Ligand binder design. Structure first.
Ligand code: HEC
Ligand code: HEC
Lengths: 159, 160
């Protein structure tokens, strides 16, 4: 079963319940290491929909209909009883990408990339290939997903 | 009824959990070695999960039921720079820690939490820990019921 609901123009409605999908990894780009203004502030927690996770464990490929959500959160502090580093604060927003060879036949890898103005928006804004796919195409380890940073995906694909 | 996540020996020791990566992620933090005298206490990234039944209960109540299992997975820092900017990015898996709340199995431990260490992903079961080794820091400093919910935005957003 596909996990992305759409409008008529194949625009992605804001995903709901993605926090109960399969988490695949977290990174952090703090503002203070990026001239006080990270591109994606700051923590990033990333999820893949459960059906696509199932298909990934079998094939090590992203099926048609894969949805991946990147959730941004703030750095809430830099020191805790466990030591120094970065610790998350409040949610900041989300980004998403959807793979569909039928609805997006001419985008790189048949991926559409979406931004969201706020948590209350009812739908995403599809982006031009220049804005997001170009960087993913140029540097992602596998099929435009930065799986070099998702150890859940790497450990979970078939041997 | 809800499912029972985690299995236990007759001495009530948690068997090494399987499938916890399909549980509910509640937040990640990072204590890099280079920021902690080249040896962090829990190196380095920590990805945290709560079992799906306790997550269902937490959504309704905001408390940790009896039978709550939380798993903290450790991973190394893989790199400090990527096309998205400077920071910290995960590498390989290092190991796990876990805590289990059960007033029937652990009537005398603080909070009725049992803290477990694991010697490897290959171990059959965990090693339960003395109160000073784990529960002490957790009871003094965690925001809620010995769980550090100040670092679990999923938990804080999901409670009623
Ligand atoms: C993370 C991201 C994800 C998660 C899946 C993945 O491929 O990692 C999504 C759905 C997304 N972004 Fe992309 N992005 C970049 C890198 C290195 C990572 C992982 C490391 C981290 O989390 O910091 C990403 C790289 C880039 C980038 C390089 C200059 C650009 C311009 C973009 N990303 C742009 C976008 C988007 C355009 C608005 C967009 C919707 C993204 N990313 C979504
Ligand atoms: C994270 C942890 C978790 C996840 C649930 C939680 O309460 O956060 C578990 C299951 C666990 N550790 Fe504990 N721990 C500490 C802090 C600040 C955090 C969250 C921020 C982060 O990820 O860095 C924890 C603090 C401490 C601490 C203070 C010095 C000590 C002594 C311990 N933790 C000890 C233990 C354990 C004994 C070996 C053990 C099995 C833990 N923690 C498990």
């Amino acid at each position: 079963l596909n996990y992305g609901s759409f409008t008529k123009e194949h625009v992605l409605l804001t995903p709901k319940g993605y926090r109960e999908w399969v988490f695949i990894g977290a990174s952090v780009t703090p503002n203070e290491l990026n001239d006080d203004k990270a591109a994606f502030p700051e923590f990033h927690n990333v999820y893949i929909d459960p059906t696509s996770w199932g298909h990934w464990k079998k094939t090590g490929e992203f099926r048609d209909g894969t949805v991946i959500v990147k959730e941004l959160a703030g750095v809430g502090s830099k020191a805790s009883p466990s030591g120094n580093g970065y610790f998350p604060g409040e949610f900041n927003g989300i980004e998403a990408m959807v793979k569909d060879s039928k609805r997006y036949p001419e985008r790189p890898g048949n991926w559409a990339f979406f931004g969201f103005e706020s948590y209350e928006a009812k739908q995403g804004i599809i982006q031009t290939d220049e804005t997001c796919a170009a960087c993913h195409k140029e540097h992602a380890a596998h099929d435009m997903v930065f799986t070099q940073f998702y150890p859940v995906l790497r450990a979970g694909k078939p041997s």
